[PDB]
């Protein structure tokens, strides 16, 4: 796989999803707004926190750093020493792809369930052109 | 929230900054309108434009720069061009008359009028920055409003703000190619009075960039426009450790502790590694282990000077893009086994490294290719002493017949400081031969 | 029940110590949300040592996170396990130290350490019985080497009789990544011999070569060297949390390993390191772990330990093992090469066997060495500070800040003390 | 769930046990692991709502309607 070809074809192309993380079932849980970025150049995911005025949170712009996200780990990877080693392609059975991000579906990242409720106009056009999906209506 | 003032005086520095400020708007999402795109996302975190741009609640993003020139015609083309709706209309300070290659027409006579409208923007600009860190001035030595007038800011900004590092980037006069007839005169005047207030004044040359663009870029019959986007990329790689993230972040507070050993040995010079056209940059492997060695050429230096006549004192290798830090470390140890790249005895360490996570950018309609990596070394060599040998000898022939003088003394300036500015630049030159004595 | 306070200063100590909690929480069963998902019931029964439990079950750690440049505490909260800490525990200014020793211990440090020590005190009171202090120093400059000794010389004024556990990355014989590096080293080892009961040395040179010929990596970044550090860092405190067969806490590990008061700088290690390729071609037992432990190429500090002896060696053991196997194979290694120890004390091995192996193995160990070869690591900084000194190089960013010059010979004269003490008893 | 408790004196960890009071160590520990998975009386010093509109009957027969 020509990593340079993927980079050159998809340079600065980012899919942007609007998501909620509903944690209200937790004792101090709040329903919170997040922006999910999927970078087409390297298949990496970044999760940004949306801060409202007077929300009482420390202004940290990121929930998750830009990294490649494992969808399914190999059964033996339960014993993988994550404290010393980064997860390689050998421990991951399936990586998150652009196909896995769908408006109106729950998305489970690192044990947090995000509900994707909308996507930007570029992402909407990209899904129409690449996957032949009909218009991705925003969920209220 | 760490901030930087970017003053552009003279006629060169107002012209580099036309090509400098198009690059910061390009790295982030900001249109030349100043607004941010509705649909396209560039990927920017939340505050990475916080360093150079002051976001206002109206949606516009407003830059931190002051573009002052006494001769009006060069800021009036920025006041009409593509970047009109970017600036603050009070930033662009317009004069009335020339400075006309005269030091004393810009520093003393006409300079006494315009200076309070210059300073009353800087002392307003500081009061909105809550994390201010220093200055990024852009002028030129061989003129009359970038030479006389830079030391009229420098001997006041040092008085008010005290100890904050000030990093001015100046086009050094070239050996053979030269335009003004009087630039051996007004070069010495702006370094007798600004070496006492500078902290690190970097050097760029016109003759050296005219040759590395002839060969590496393989362009020919070049312009001034094709030079400004090579000086716009150095300063956007200096100021990438304030807007991005990475392994080693070298920010602006320690450029005086990394690069300045003794308090008057602060004249370092910079290069940039992967300058290849779009037909040859895909035909070889450009990795970490050789773009750190293409930095150490004689023919890749932005200043026309042989590095091989003097030993280095302190480097700084500011990497960028896709670099893992093992590849730097085996590559610096390649350098010190070579008996040509001569380091010197009181500094065993010498090298200082920063890494980052954002690749180089390319301007649309550019001359440069798309590369993953970028290295911008900054070296404090002792070879620049004989770049000051010639320009004292240029002074020593024209003063030897009192030539060209009376345009200076007429416009409020004593003759008594010609003899003591060249008394001074002996005492600057006597230091570089003193420090090299092991 | 016997808790330890953790402190994170500097760049290199913030980032390694934040890779320390992703190994600690992995052993005990906390997901990055902060709640508990684990299988074994032996993790819960001594969870209090490093963690505080919070109303709801979000098991919150016990570290204090101070640095002046705020760009890294916006960068370690944003990790995989960053979102567990205390947001009250974050202390910062805005002016970075700039690799200066007098911006940490003298000038800006007179501001913030009056507000550092009262966030330490807010978790000393919630500990039932404290016994020690972890700090992740970073000797590579003046952001975690200057103000690190501004905290441990203030904590040791408060608690005279408690353990100090500093894990400090040490300068290197290769080309360094800071030009004022021999300046800032010798300032901060004048005080580390008076306030710490050990200082576990780490070198970036050795951790580029443990992972070069043993683990055989291809591109080892900074994310992989920290697992090597954090594994030893989590192996020394196992007898405090997990049941064992000879149990040895941090004072049990004290009187073994310091004969004279000023010989406490040590050397770390970790036994069962294999390739990704030859894992199933290799069978591991006690007598193979012993040969993997006692070689010069499995030390995490860039010295060769065959230019000296060992005053006291301790190797803690984890897993399901017997103890004739353990003890008789430390008797052979004191007998097969007995000219590399000290004759004036007969025994040289402290043995501690736990009953819980780590994640992903069946037995592991951790090697701790106190050699006389550490003077070589101190000979270099004694040799390359002097040549940066007699010409007064690089200097006025100290003296122009609050330094003097009279303590630049009253720190070198104590650097060359420790070289004299290690060599004299050889 | 019999034998879901801890002995009196177990140094160790039991969750939800800093937050429960009032009974000794084994009785609390069983709770700490299950959680880990008609007319009013005269001369009363309290207020019946409506006690401005009652006349001519008994406190028993006028405070019955409050509870029914």
User: Which CATH number goes with the domain that contains C220?
Assistant: 3.40.50.1440
Residues C248, C282, single domain; the answer is: no
Q: C34 to chain A: which residues are within 8 Å by CB?
A: none
Q: Please, what is the end-to-end C-alpha distance for chain B in angstroms?
A: 44
DSSP 3-state assignment of C63?
A: strand
* Residues B243 and B48: beta-carbon distance below 8 Å: yes
Place of tokens 């980037």: B169
Same domain (yes/no): C120, C243: yes
Residue labelled with tokens 């003394």: B409
CB contact under 8 A, A37 and B370: no
Strands C310-319 and C265-266: unpaired
Q: Which helix (H) or strand (E) holds C6?
A: strand C3-8
The neighbouring-strand residues paired with C166 are C135, C199
Three-state SS for B70-113 is: CCHHHCCCCCCCCCCCCCCCCCCEECCCCCCCCCCHHHHHCHHH
Judge contact between C96 and B251, C-beta under 8 A: yes
- C174 CB neighbours in chain B (<8 A) are 329, 333
Residue A114, classed as helix, strand or coil, is strand
Minimal Cα–Cα distance from A94 to chain B, Å?
Answer: 24
Do C168 and C275 fall within a single domain?
Answer: no
C143 is in an annotated binding site: yes
- Decide: C346 and C306 in contact? Cβ < 8 Å: no
Long-range Cβ pairs for the range C328-335 (8 Å, 24+): C329/C286, C329/C287, C329/C290, C330/C290, C333/C290, C333/C294
Angle B180-B226-B278 (CA atoms, 0-180°, nearest 5)?
155
- Greatest distance between any 2 Cα atoms in chain D: 67
**DSSP states along C161-183:** TSEEEEEEEE--SS--S-TTHHH
The residue to which tokens 């705020």 are assigned = C70
CA distances, C78 to each of A59, A62, B245, B406, C84 (Å): 12, 6, 12, 65, 11
Residue in this structure with the two tokens 């315009």, named with its chain if needed: B114
Q: Which CATH superfamily is domain B2-268 in?
A: Tubulin/FtsZ, GTPase domain (3.40.50.1440)
Count of other CB atoms within 10 angstroms of residue B241: 21
Residue with tokens 């066997």: C353
Structure tokens at D54: 């009652």
* Contact call for residues A96 and A66 (beta carbons, < 8 A): no
C385: containing domain: 375-425
Contact C57 D11 (CB under 8 A): no
Q: Please provide the size of chain C in residues.
A: 426
CA C136 – CA C9 distance, rounded (Å): 6
Chain C residues with beta carbon closer than 8 angstroms to that of D11: 1
Q: Which of C222, C257, C292 is the last residue of a domain?
A: C257
Q: How many CB atoms lie within 10 A of CB B225?
A: 11
> A24: number of CA atoms within 13 Å, CB side?
5
Angle (CA) C88-C93-C96 rounded to 5° is: 135
Do residues B241 and B318 touch, judged by C-beta distance below 8 A?
Answer: yes
Chain A to chain C Cβ contacts (< 8 Å): 57
Same domain, C364 and C386: no
* Strand, coil or helix: C146: coil
What distance lies between CA C372 and its chain's CA centroid? 18
For residue C260, the SS3 value is coil
**Residue B18 to residue B74: CA distance in whole angstroms:** 10
Joined together, the tokens standing for residue B263 give 């308090």
CATH number reported for the structural domain that contains residue C380 in this entry: 1.10.287.600
| C359 vs A60, A65, A81: nearest CB | A81
d(CA C397, CA C374): 30
Could you please state the CATH topology (level 3) that the domain comprising B384-438 is classified under.
Helix Hairpins (1.10.287)
Task: Provide the phi-psi class of A66: left if phi over 0, else alpha when psi is between -120 and 50, else beta.
Answer: beta
Q: What is the helix (H) or strand (E) element at residue C12, kind and residue range?
A: helix C11-18
Under 8 Å between Cβ of C179 and B258:
yes
Does residue B40 contact residue A122 with C-beta atoms inside 8 Å? yes
**Shortest CA distance to D63 belongs to which of C330, D49, B424?**
D49
Kindly calculate the radius of gyration of chain D based on its CA atoms and give it in whole angstroms.
24
CB atoms within 10 A of CB B327: 18
Task: Take residue B244 and report the two structure tokens written for it.
Answer: 């991005």
Listed residues C227, C257, C287: the one ending a domain: C257
- Contact across the interface for C220 and B253, Cβ inside 8 Å: no
Residue whose entry in the numeric block shows the structure tokens 């090579």: B230
CB contact, 8 Å: B372 with chain A? yes
> Residue for token digits 């929930």?
A63
Q: Does the annotation flag C142 for ligand binding?
A: yes
Question: H/E element holding B395?
Answer: helix B390-398
Catalytic residue among B77, B113, B254, B414: B254
Q: At what angle do helices B225-238 and B13-27 cross, to 10 degrees?
A: 60
Residue of C nearest to A91 (CA): C276
Co-location of C246 and C275 in the same domain? no
DSSP C4: E
| DSSP 3-state of A77 | helix
Q: Which residue has the tokens 């649309």?
A: B364
C32 to A110: CB separation less than 8 angstroms, yes or no: yes
In a mutagenesis test of the B interface, which of C97, C173, C175 is the best target, namely the one with the most B β-carbons within 10 Å?
C175
On whether any CB of chain A is under 8 Å from the CB of C32, the answer is yes
What H or E segment, with its residue span, contains residue A31? strand A31-39
DSSP letters, C300-363, are: SSS--TTSS-EEEEEEEEEES--HHHHHHHHHTHHHHTGGGB-TTSS--EEEEEBS---TT-SE
PDB resolution in Å:
7.7
The answer to whether the CB atoms of A61 and B45 lie below 8 A apart is yes
Q: Are the beta carbons of C162 and C133 closer than 8 angstroms? A: yes
- The count of CB pairs under 8 A between chains B and C is 84
- List chains adjacent to chain A, taking adjacency as at least 3 C-beta pairs closer than 8 Å: B, C
DSSP-derived letter for residue B321 is B
Task: Give the separation between CA A16 and CA A37, rounded to whole angstroms.
Answer: 5
CB B308 within 8 A of CB B343: no
Place of tokens 């400098």: B20
Residues C231 and C303 in one domain: no
Nearest Cα residue to C166 out of C126, C137, C124:
C137
Distance CA C241, CA C248 (A): 11
Tell me how close the Cα of D17 comes to any Cα of chain C, in angstroms: 10
Question: How determined?
Answer: cryo-EM
Distances in whole angstroms, Cα of residue B183 to Cα of each of A74, B174, B175? 71, 11, 12
Please tell me the distance from the alpha carbon of residue C175 to that of residue C166, in angstroms, as a whole number. 24
Tokens of C269: 């290690």
**Side-by-side strand order, sheet with C363-371:** C349-353, C310-319, C363-371
Residue C235's Cβ-count burial label (10 Å; 0-12, 13-18, 19+) is buried
Rounded Cα distance between C382 and C415, Å, is 7
- Nearest by CB: C26 against A26, A83, A86: A83
Give backbone dihedrals phi and psi of B217, rounded to 5 degrees, phi first. Answer: -65, -30
Give the integer Cα–Cα distance in Å for A125 and A136: 10
Show residues of chain A in contact with B372, CB under 8 Å: 7
Chains C & D: contacts with CB separation below 8 Å: 15
| Cα torsion through C108, C112, C114, C119, rounded to 10 | -160
For an interface test with B, the pick among C203, C394, C396 (most B C-beta atoms closer than 10 Å) comes out as C394
Question: Do residues B61 and B24 lie in contact, with contact meaning Cβ atoms separated by under 8 Å?
Answer: no
Pair of tokens at residue C423: 């060599």
Residue B156, classified by CB atoms within 10 Å of its CB into exposed (0-12), middle (13-18) or buried (19+), is middle
Interchain CB distance below 8 Å, A60 and C360: no
Pairwise CA distance, residues C25 & C32, whole Å = 9
Task: Write out the residues of chain C at the interface with chain B, using a CB-CB cutoff of 8 A.
Answer: 69, 71, 75, 94-100, 174-182, 208, 219-222, 384, 387-388, 391, 393-394, 396-397
- C290 and C369: one domain? yes
| Coil vs helix vs strand at C9 | coil
Residue with tokens 């070289």: C419
The torsion angle over the Cα atoms of residues C37, C40, C46 and C48, rounded to 10 degrees, is 0
Contacts of B326 in chain C (CB under 8 A): 208, 219-221
Tell me which chain B residue has its CA closest to the CA of residue C222.
B325
Q: Which of A27, A79, A86 sits opposite C360 (nearest CB)?
A: A79
The conformational region for residue C77 under phi > 0 = left, psi -120 to 50 = alpha, else beta, is alpha
| Alpha carbon distances (Å) from C295 to B430, C236, C337, C405 | 54, 20, 12, 42
Give the residue among B87, B206, B89, B66 at the shortest CA–CA distance from B150: B66
Do the annotations mark residue C104 as ligand-binding? no
CA distances (Å), origin B150, targets B90, B112, B272: 20, 13, 26
Structural Rg of chain C based on CA atoms: 21
Chains that contact B by 3+ CB pairs under 8 Å?
A: A, C
Contacts of B15 (CB under 8 A, 6+ apart): B74, B224, B228
Residue C30: strand pairing partners: C36
Could you tell me if B158 and B180 are in contact, meaning their C-beta atoms sit under 8 angstroms apart? Answer: no
Taking the Cβ of residue B283 and every Cβ of chain A, the question of whether any pair is shorter than 8 Å is answered with no
Instruction: State the greatest distance between any 2 C-alpha atoms of chain B, in Å, as a whole number.
Output: 67
Which DSSP string corresponds to C384-412?
A: HHHTTTTT-TT-HHHHTTT--STTSSTTH
Terminal-to-terminal C-alpha distance of chain C: 40
Fold classified for B269-383 = 60s Ribosomal Protein L30; Chain: A; (3.30.1330)
Are residues A83 and C22, on separate chains, in Cβ contact within 8 Å?
Answer: yes
Residues C24, C132, single domain; the answer is yes
Q: Which of C105, C148, C106, C193 lies closest to C414, judged by CA?
A: C193
Q: CB contact, 8 Å: B45 with chain A?
A: yes
Q: Which residue has the tokens 């317009």?
A: B94
Report helix angle B390-398 to B183-192, nearest 10.
120
Three-state DSSP at A101 gives: coil
Q: Give the B-side interface with C, CB within 8 Å.
A: 1-2, 131, 245, 247-249, 251, 253-254, 256-258, 261-263, 314, 324-327, 329, 332-333, 336, 345-353
Measured in angstroms, the CA of B243 and the nearest CA of chain C are apart by 10
Domain limits, chain B: 2-268, 269-383, 384-438
Q: Give the burial string for A102-112 (b: 16+ CB within 10 Å, else e).
A: ebeeebebeeb
Q: Which H, E and C letters describe B125-178, residue by residue?
A: HHHHCCCEEEECCEEECCCCCCCCCHHHHHHHHHHHHCCCCECCEEEECCCCCC
Longest dimension (CA), chain C: 63
Helix (H, G, I), strand (E, B) or coil at C205: coil
Using a CB-CB cut-off of 8 Å, the residues of chain A touching C92 are none
**In the beta sheet, which residues pair with residue A106?**
A115
Picking from C336, C351, C374, the residue at the C-terminal end of a domain is C374
- C-alpha to C-alpha distance for C7 and A46, rounded to whole angstroms: 29
Closest CA to C241 of D12, B389, B178: D12
Chains that touch D (3 or more CB pairs under 8 A): C
Q: Are C161 and C245 part of one and the same domain? A: yes
Angle, nearest 10°, between helix axes C21-28 and C222-235? 60
Q: State the angle between helix axes of B111-128 and B150-161 in degrees (0 to 180), rounded to the nearest 10.
A: 40
User: What is residue B4's three-state secondary structure?
Assistant: strand
Same fold for the pair B2-268 and B384-438:
no
Residue with tokens 């760009």: C71
- My answer on whether C42 and C151 are in the same domain is yes
Both C366 and C389 in one domain: the answer is no
Residue A65, H or E segment: strand A62-67
Are the Cβ atoms of A80 and C360 closer than 8 angstroms?
yes
Measured CA to CA, the distance from residue B362 to residue B355 in angstroms comes to 19
Residue-level length of chain A:
140
In angstroms, the first-to-last Cα distance of chain D is: 41
Residue pair C369/C155 in contact by the 8 Å Cβ criterion: no
C287 and C242 in a common domain: no
Angle, alpha carbons D38-D43-D48 (nearest 5°): 55
Half-sphere CA count of B411, side-chain side, radius 13 A: 19
Which residues make Cβ contacts (< 8 Å) with residue C3, sequence separation at least 6?
Answer: C48, C49, C50, C62, C127, C128, C129, C130, C131
| Binding site per annotation, positions of B | 10-12, 15, 71, 99, 140, 143-146, 179, 183, 206, 224, 228, 252
C175 contacts in chain B (CB < 8 Å)? 329, 332-333, 336, 349-351
Burial of B363 per CB tally in 10 Å (0-12, 13-18, 19+): middle
C11 is in an annotated binding site: yes
CA distance C204 to C188: 19
Question: From the CA of B16, how many Å to the nearest CA of chain A?
Answer: 26
Q: Which residue of chain B has the CA closest to A47?
A: B45
CB B171 within 8 A of CB B8: no
Contact D13 C55 (CB under 8 A): no
CB contact at 8 A, B179 and B171? no
Give the contacts of C248 (CB within 8 A, at least 6 positions apart). C239, C314, C316, C350, C352
HSE-CB for C401 with a 13 A CA cutoff: 20
Task: Give the residue numbers of the binding site of B for Mg(2+).
Answer: 71
Residues facing A33 on adjacent strands? A20
CA distance, residue A26 to nearest chain C CA (Å): 8
User: How far is B71 from C138, CA to CA, in rounded Å?
Assistant: 53
Which chain B positions have a beta carbon within 8 Å of A120's beta carbon?
A: 39, 41
Q: Residue with structure tokens 């005047």?
A: B189
Q: Are the beta carbons of A48 and B46 separated by less than 8 Å?
A: yes
| Residue C201 phi, psi (nearest 5) | -70, 145
Q: What is the C-alpha separation between C97 and C85, in angstroms, rounded?
A: 24
Domain count, chain C: 3
Q: d(Cα A43, Cα C416) in Å, to the nearest integer?
A: 54
Inter-residue contact B213 to B227 (CB < 8 Å): yes
B409-416 contacts at long range (C-beta below 8 A, 24 or more positions apart)? B409/B104, B411/B102, B411/B104, B411/B105, B411/B108, B411/B109, B412/B104, B412/B108, B412/B109, B413/B103, B413/B104, B413/B108
Nearest to B405 by CA among B393, B389, B392, B417: B417
Is the Cβ–Cβ distance between C275 and C215 less than 8 Å? yes
| Pair C371, C303: CB distance under 8 Å | yes
Q: Are A43 and A56 in contact (CB under 8 A)?
A: no
CATH of the domain at C348: 3.30.1330.20
Helix (H) or strand (E) holding B14: helix B13-27
Q: In what order do the strands lie in the sheet with A31-39?
A: A62-67, A44-49, A31-39, A14-22, A112-119, A106-109
**Using CA atoms, how far apart are residues B236 and B310, in angstroms rounded to an integer?**
28
- In the block, tokens 């004393």 appear at B104
Is residue B433 among the annotated active site residues? no
CA distance C38 to C217: 31
- Strand, coil or helix: what is C144? strand
d(CA B146, CA B101): 9
CB A26 within 8 A of CB A9: no
Q: Specify which residues C61 forms β-bridges with.
A: C51
| Chain-chain contact of B41 with A16 (C-beta, under 8 angstroms) | yes
Interchain proximity C53–D12, CB inside 8 Å: no
């Amino acid at each position: 796989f020509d990593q340079l070809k993927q980079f050159l074809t998809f340079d600065k192309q980012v899919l942007r999803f609007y998501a909620i993380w509903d944690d209200t079932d937790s004792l101090f849980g709040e329903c919170r707004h997040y922006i999910i970025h999927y970078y087409l150049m390297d298949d990496t995911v970044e999760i940004r926190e949306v801060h409202e005025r007077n929300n009482g949170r420390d202004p940290f712009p990121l929930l998750m750093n830009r990294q490649r996200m494992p969808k399914v780990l190999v059964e033996n990877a339960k014993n993988f020493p994550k404290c010393v080693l980064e997860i390689s392609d050998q421990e991951v059975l399936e990586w998150y792809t652009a196909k896995d991000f769908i408006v109106g579906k729950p998305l489970t990242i690192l044990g947090r369930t995000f509900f994707i409720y909308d996507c930007d106009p570029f992402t909407r056009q990209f899904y129409k052109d690449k996957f032949g999906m009909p218009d991705l209506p925003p969920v209220d | 929230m760490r901030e930087c003032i970017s003053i552009h005086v003279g006629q060169a520095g107002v012209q580099i900054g036309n090509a400098c400020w198009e690059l910061y708007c390009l790295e982030h999402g900001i249109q030349p309108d100043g607004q941010m795109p509705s649909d396209k996302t560039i990927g920017g975190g939340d505050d990475s434009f916080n360093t150079f741009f002051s976001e206002t609640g109206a949606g516009k993003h407003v830059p931190r720069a002051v573009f002052v020139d006494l001769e009006p015609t060069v800021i009036d083309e920025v006041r009409t061009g593509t970047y009109r709706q970017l600036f603050h209309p009070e930033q662009l300070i317009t004069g009335k008359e020339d400075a006309a290659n005269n030091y004393a027409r810009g520093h003393y006579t006409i300079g006494k009028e315009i200076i309070d409208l210059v300073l009353d923007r800087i002392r307003k600009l500081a009061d909105q920055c809550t994390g201010l860190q220093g200055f990024l001035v852009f002028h030129s030595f061989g003129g009359g409003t970038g030479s006389g007038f830079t030391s009229l800011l420098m001997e006041r900004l040092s008085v008010d703000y005290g100890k904050k590092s000030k990093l001015e980037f100046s086009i050094y006069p070239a050996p053979q190619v030269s335009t003004a007839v009087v630039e051996p005169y007004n070069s010495i005047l702006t370094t007798h009075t600004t070496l006492e207030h500078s902290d690190c004044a970097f050097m760029v040359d016109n003759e050296a960039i005219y040759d590395i663009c002839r060969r590496n870029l393989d362009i020919e019959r070049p312009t001034y426009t094709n030079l400004n986007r090579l000086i716009g990329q150095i300063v956007s790689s200096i100021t990438a450790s304030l807007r991005f993230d990475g392994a080693l972040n070298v920010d602006l507070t320690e450029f005086q502790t990394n690069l300045v050993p003794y308090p008057r040995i602060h004249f370092p010079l910079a290069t940039y590694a992967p300058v290849i056209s779009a037909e040859k940059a895909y035909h070889e492997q450009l990795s970490v282990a050789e773009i750190t060695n293409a930095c150490f050429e004689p023919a890749n230096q932005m200043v026309k000077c042989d590095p091989r006549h003097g030993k280095y004192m302190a480097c700084c290798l500011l990497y960028r893009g896709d670099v893992v830090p093992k590849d730097v470390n085996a590559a610096i140890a390649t350098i010190k086994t070579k008996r040509t790249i001569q380091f010197v005895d009181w500094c065993p360490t010498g090298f200082k490294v920063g890494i980052n996570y954002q690749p180089p950018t390319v301007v649309p309609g550019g001359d440069l290719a798309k590369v993953q990596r970028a290295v911008c070394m900054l070296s404090n060599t002792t070879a620049i002493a004989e770049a000051w040998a010639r320009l004292d000898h240029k002074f020593d022939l024209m003063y030897a017949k009192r030539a060209f003088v009376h345009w200076y003394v007429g416009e409020g300036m004593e003759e008594g400081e010609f003899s003591e500015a060249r008394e001074d630049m002996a005492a600057l030159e006597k230091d570089y031969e003193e420090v090299g004595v092991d | 029940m016997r808790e330890i306070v953790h402190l994170q200063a500097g760049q290199c100590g913030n980032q390694i110590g934040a890779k320390f909690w992703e190994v600690i929480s992995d052993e005990h069963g906390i997901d990055p949300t902060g709640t508990y998902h684990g299988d074994s019931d032996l993790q819960l029964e001594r969870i209090n040592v490093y963690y505080n439990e919070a109303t709801g079950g979000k098991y919150v750690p016990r570290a204090v996170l101070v640095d002046l440049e705020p760009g890294t505490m916006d960068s370690v909260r944003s990790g995989p396990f960053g979102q567990i800490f205390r947001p009250d525990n974050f202390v910062f200014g805005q002016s970075g130290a700039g690799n200066n020793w007098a911006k940490g211990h003298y000038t800006e440090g007179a501001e913030l350490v009056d507000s550092v020590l009262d966030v330490v005190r807010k978790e000393a009171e919630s500990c039932d019985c404290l016994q020690g202090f972890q700090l992740t120093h970073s000797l590579g400059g003046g952001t975690g080497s200057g103000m690190g000794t501004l905290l441990i010389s203030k904590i040791r004024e408060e608690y005279p009789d408690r353990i100090m556990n500093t894990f400090s990355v040490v300068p290197s014989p290769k080309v360094s990544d800071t030009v004022v590096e021999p300046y800032n080293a010798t300032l901060s080892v004048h005080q580390l011999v008076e306030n710490t009961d050990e200082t576990y040395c780490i070198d970036n040179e050795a951790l580029y070569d443990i992972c070069f010929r043993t683990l055989k990596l291809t591109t080892p970044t900074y994310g992989d060297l920290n697992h090597l550090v954090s594994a030893t860092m989590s192996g020394v405190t196992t007898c405090l949390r997990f049941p064992g067969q000879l149990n040895a806490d941090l004072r049990k590990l004290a009187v073994n390993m310091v004969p004279f008061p000023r010989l406490h700088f040590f050397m770390p290690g970790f036994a069962p390191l294999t390739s990704r390729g030859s894992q199933q071609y290799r069978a591991l037992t006690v007598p193979e772990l012993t040969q993997q432990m006692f070689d010069a190429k499995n030390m995490m500090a860039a010295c060769d330990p065959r230019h000296g002896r060992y005053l006291t060696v301790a190797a803690v053991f984890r897993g399901r093992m017997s103890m004739k196997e353990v003890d008789e194979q430390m008797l052979n290694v004191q007998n097969k090469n007995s000219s590399y120890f000290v004759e004036w004390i007969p025994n040289n091995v402290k043995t501690a066997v736990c009953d819980i192996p780590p994640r992903g193995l069946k037995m592991s160990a951790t090697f701790i060495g106190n050699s006389t070869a550490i003077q070589e690591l101190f000979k270099r900084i004694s040799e390359q500070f002097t040549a940066m000194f007699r010409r007064k190089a690089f200097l006025h960013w100290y003296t122009g800040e609050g330094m003097d010059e009279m303590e630049f010979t009253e720190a070198e004269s104590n650097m060359n003390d420790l070289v004299s003490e290690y060599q004299q008893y050889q | 769930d019999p034998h879901k408790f801890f002995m009196s004196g177990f140094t160790g960890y039991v969750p939800r046990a800093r937050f429960l009071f009032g009974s000794s160590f084994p009785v609390l520990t069983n709770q700490a692991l299950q959680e880990f998975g008609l007319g009013l009386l005269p001369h009363y010093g309290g207020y019946v709502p409506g006690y401005k509109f009652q006349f001519g009957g008994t406190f028993g027969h006028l405070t019955h309607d409050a509870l029914g």
